[PDB]
């Protein structure tokens, strides 16, 4: 059996990272709700 | 089939050969009850080969003993086959049977095993 999380340092940043949030417009609404709710970590 | 021990009929043959050749050396060992109600039935059939002193019996005893080596004869080697036919088989040359005894120590800690001490009489 082969599970559903095969970790990678590059695809984790090229997809969920900071500069892929600020790329589009709806990423800047995601980052507008995680520094509003008061999270410690904005972007994984 | 004298008495099984929880070993798989192949280990019990090569377990008694690890208690016999370490009892002619140390002259006493500390072990469980049922591991030493059977090794009195082996090492007393093996000093009997010591009282003969043949050529057949120096070979026919070697198939139930290991080949270990002893150092302190004041720095002279003595294989465990040669410790018998020797200082063991000459101490008992006028005692017909009954070479061992079993002294019950106590239950050991954390296993509940009735420990005994076997020693050559």
């Amino acid at each position: 059996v082969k599970r559903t999380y095969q970790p990678n340092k590059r695809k984790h940043s090229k997809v969920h990272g900071f500069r892929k949030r600020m790329s589009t417009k709806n990423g800047r609404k995601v980052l507008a709700r995680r520094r509003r709710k008061g999270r410690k970590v904005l972007s994984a | 089939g004298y008495r099984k021990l929880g070993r798989t009929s192949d280990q019990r043959k090569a377990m008694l050969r690890d208690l016999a050749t370490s009892l002619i050396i140390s002259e006493r060992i500390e072990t469980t009850e049922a591991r030493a109600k059977e090794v009195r039935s082996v090492v007393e059939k093996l000093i009997t080969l010591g009282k003969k002193g043949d050529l057949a019996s120096r070979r026919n005893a070697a198939k139930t003993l290991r080949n270990v080596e002893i150092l302190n004869e004041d720095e002279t080697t003595q294989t465990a086959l040669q410790k018998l036919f020797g200082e063991i088989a000459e101490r008992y040359t006028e005692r017909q049977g009954g070479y061992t005894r079993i002294l019950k120590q106590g239950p050991r800690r954390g296993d509940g095993a009735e420990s005994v001490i076997i020693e050559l009489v």
Binding site: - | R101, L103, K104, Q105, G106
Partner: protein, 53 residues
């Protein structure tokens, strides 16, 4: 298969009437002057006294 009822405190304490340990069966080691378990050697100084061990 599961229990059908909750077994009570009367039925529980009855079932462990026979759940206990027995006395060791001691002696008096007559040379040192202690207690030892019979047919065994002494853990202190002590002879077997039929064997002097």
């Amino acid at each position: 298969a599961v229990p059908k009822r909750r077994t009570s405190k009367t039925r529980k304490n009855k079932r462990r009437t026979h759940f206990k340990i027995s006395v060791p069966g001691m002696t008096e080691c007559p040379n040192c002057g202690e207690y030892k378990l019979s047919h065994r050697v002494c853990k202190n100084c002590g002879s077997y006294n039929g064997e002097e061990v």
